[PDB]
Enzyme design. Sequence first.
Site, PDB file in Angstrom:
ATOM      1  N   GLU A 112      -6.549 -32.604  -5.239  1.00 16.68           N
ATOM      2  CA  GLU A 112      -6.349 -31.700  -6.367  1.00 16.68           C
ATOM      3  C   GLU A 112      -7.041 -30.346  -6.210  1.00 16.68           C
ATOM      4  O   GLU A 112      -6.418 -29.322  -6.553  1.00 16.68           O
ATOM      5  CB  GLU A 112      -6.794 -32.424  -7.644  1.00 16.68           C
ATOM      6  CG  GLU A 112      -5.838 -33.577  -8.045  1.00 16.68           C
ATOM      7  CD  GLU A 112      -6.485 -34.654  -8.933  1.00 16.68           C
ATOM      8  OE1 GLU A 112      -7.659 -34.485  -9.341  1.00 16.68           O
ATOM      9  OE2 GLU A 112      -5.806 -35.673  -9.205  1.00 16.68           O
ATOM     10  N   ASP A 125       1.290 -33.234 -10.207  1.00 20.26           N
ATOM     11  CA  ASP A 125      -0.086 -33.572 -10.562  1.00 20.26           C
ATOM     12  C   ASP A 125      -0.024 -34.832 -11.414  1.00 20.26           C
ATOM     13  O   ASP A 125       0.455 -34.799 -12.554  1.00 20.26           O
ATOM     14  CB  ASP A 125      -0.721 -32.397 -11.304  1.00 20.26           C
ATOM     15  CG  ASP A 125      -2.097 -32.708 -11.883  1.00 20.26           C
ATOM     16  OD1 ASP A 125      -2.633 -33.832 -11.648  1.00 20.26           O
ATOM     17  OD2 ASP A 125      -2.646 -31.792 -12.577  1.00 20.26           O
ATOM     18  N   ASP A 148     -13.658 -28.656 -11.449  1.00 22.61           N
ATOM     19  CA  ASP A 148     -12.570 -29.434 -12.034  1.00 22.61           C
ATOM     20  C   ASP A 148     -13.135 -30.477 -12.989  1.00 22.61           C
ATOM     21  O   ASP A 148     -13.687 -31.495 -12.560  1.00 22.61           O
ATOM     22  CB  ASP A 148     -11.739 -30.085 -10.931  1.00 22.61           C
ATOM     23  CG  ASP A 148     -10.448 -30.708 -11.449  1.00 22.61           C
ATOM     24  OD1 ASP A 148     -10.313 -30.864 -12.678  1.00 22.61           O
ATOM     25  OD2 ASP A 148      -9.561 -31.018 -10.619  1.00 22.61           O
ATOM     26  N   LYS A 193      -4.972 -44.478 -13.858  1.00 21.29           N
ATOM     27  CA  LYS A 193      -5.574 -43.889 -12.663  1.00 21.29           C
ATOM     28  C   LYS A 193      -6.980 -44.414 -12.403  1.00 21.29           C
ATOM     29  O   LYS A 193      -7.458 -44.327 -11.264  1.00 21.29           O
ATOM     30  CB  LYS A 193      -5.583 -42.371 -12.810  1.00 21.29           C
ATOM     31  CG  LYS A 193      -5.915 -41.595 -11.551  1.00 21.29           C
ATOM     32  CD  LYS A 193      -5.540 -40.110 -11.739  1.00 21.29           C
ATOM     33  CE  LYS A 193      -6.053 -39.208 -10.630  1.00 21.29           C
ATOM     34  NZ  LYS A 193      -5.764 -37.761 -10.937  1.00 21.29           N
TER      35      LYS A 193
END
Length: 541
Positions: free
Chosen positions: A170, A7, A193, A69
């Site tokens: 994810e 991850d 999430d 990211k």
Amino acid sequence: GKIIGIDLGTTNSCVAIMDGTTPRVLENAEGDRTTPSIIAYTQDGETLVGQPAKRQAVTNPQNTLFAIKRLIGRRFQDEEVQRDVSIMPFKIIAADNGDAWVEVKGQKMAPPQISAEVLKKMKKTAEDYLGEPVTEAVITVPAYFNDAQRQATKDAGRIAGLEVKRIINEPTAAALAYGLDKGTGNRTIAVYDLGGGAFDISIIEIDEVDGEKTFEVLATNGDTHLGGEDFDSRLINYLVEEFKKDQGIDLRNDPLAMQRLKEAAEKAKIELSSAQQTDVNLPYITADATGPKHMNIKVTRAKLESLVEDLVNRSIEPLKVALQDAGLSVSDIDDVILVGGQTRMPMVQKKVAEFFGKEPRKDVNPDEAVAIGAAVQGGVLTGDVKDVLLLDVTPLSLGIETMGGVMTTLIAKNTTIPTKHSQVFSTAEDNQSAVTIHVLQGERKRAADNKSLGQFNLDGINPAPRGMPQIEVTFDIDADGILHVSAKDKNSGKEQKITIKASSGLNEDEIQKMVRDAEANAEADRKFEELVQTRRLLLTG
Ligand SMILES: Nc1ncnc2c1ncn2[C@@H]1O[C@H](COP(=O)(O)OP(=O)(O)OP(=O)(O)O)[C@@H](O)[C@H]1O
Ligand SMILES: [Mg+2]
């Protein structure tokens, strides 16, 4: 041999592996099951990664990189990047080709090179545990990542010395982690999430038929403005305004103070998931002509809840949209899974429980489930995990319009993705100089009864009689579900192409209606297609 699951998070990264039947989250050398996604280039010429980089960030703001990211796979002129440029303390620049890069100590670096440092640390963590070299990895990305973002994440894996066996999103990873539990077959789950960089909601079907457990995404959507960093910003702004109220000093023009305040704010936020109050205490935060100044500000949970209430409430409309896009009611959701550290806020948990009318499952670890699921996918690839299938298939036929108003199928319904199919077409008229590629989705034989997905022209066709030119049309759906359509004139070399985004959901209720509609009209559609055929398939202008 073994395939590790990684991850790669906006804030934190995590690595796991299958140990026979059970996945194991691996600790780095400090003993931590997660590693901050932070990279620092020190005055003495070495590169720090993780907690060592985090610890010296406040004193080295220019050369400590975080939240990369938000840049990976993005163009410098991208709105999110421009928004990012102002707030980030390090230098974000345009590469010669227009990509968003960073510059540290006069060195221009692409985001994949930076994220590779975090992935390399995950790799050594695994190599330490196994006592052998590790090179095969499943790496996760957000469900909202586009082709460029996914490709740049793969490149980051390769720069870390990894063979990237698969990218998976994810929420699917989290679902694989949950789906290891017993009694989880033939259920619909909601994956809520709330990470550091974004909010994402996915609706996933976990079915069990003939011994095989299948996982299929029914809907997804995300919002990068609702992540934990945005929660932090609300609290930081409050601390800035409170310090001005208390001492008449605006800290915003003081980078060192703002870096300390950002770190203190995040820690205070975290603490308020456990306590009703916390104290932000920053001595020597700045100084003026009268000497040093000190911050001491009490923050209650009620105050924090007031500051971020709108952010939490903005996560509800994406839930409603995902259910609409899957054709489901809340009563169809059998379990809710919280992913992401920001879901540990009590206010978030209550709002989610209220919306779905049930308590989120407590046996899913919100910080580790994504890495665990990536490791599960690795186990599927090695055969260590049996009877598990990630299901990604086209819901409806895809094709183009051909002469007579006919839909000609290039990819049949229920084709496994990724897939690629080509067919050669020709021109309908003598000396036709161009063709129109009209992309269609649906099960009817009349093009006008199907959904139009886009269209483009290919011109420059050399003079020739009808039927002689060779126009190769290719449909390719990549692993991200994005449909790439190209048309190429084989004799002139000219090519044009378009990209078609994946649908936000798969509404099986409506899909099956469309299928039954087509079956009810099958004979009429055949007769229509047959006498058009009485006139290599041909394209009009
Ligand atoms: N106990 C807590 N209460 C509230 N917030 C928390 C808590 N623990 C961590 N956070 C926040 O959760 C966020 C990090 O979550 P997580 O590690 O799941 O993100 P990530 O997976 O790196 O991000 P992304 O999914 O966007 O790539 C940060 O904003 C952090 O401040
Ligand atoms: Mg995450």
